[PDB]
Ligand binder design. Structure first.
Ligand SMILES: *C(=O)c1ccc(-c2ccc(C(=O)OCC)cn2)nc1
Ligand SMILES: *NNC(=O)c1ccc(-c2ccc(C(N)=O)cn2)nc1
Ligand SMILES: CCc1ccccc1
Ligand SMILES: Cc1ccc(C)cc1
Length: 9
């Protein structure tokens, strides 16, 4: 989940 968001950055 963290990675799913972190792709934005
Ligand atoms: C949420 O974005 C997210 C994405 C990916 C993963 C994740 C966890 C573990 C592995 C892995 O290769 O584990 C080897 C033990 C890969 N990706 N977790 C949360
Ligand atoms: N928000 N995330 C990024 O901007 C981001 C872009 C690209 C990468 C990345 C990581 C690792 C490789 C590689 N070939 O090992 C390439 N690009 N990370 C984050
Ligand atoms: C969008 C500005 C920025 C860039 C990279 C990381 C954080 C913030
Ligand atoms: C999804 C992601 C992976 C690595 C960095 C450094 C940033 C984002």
């Amino acid at each position: 989940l963290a990675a799913a968001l972190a792709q934005a950055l």
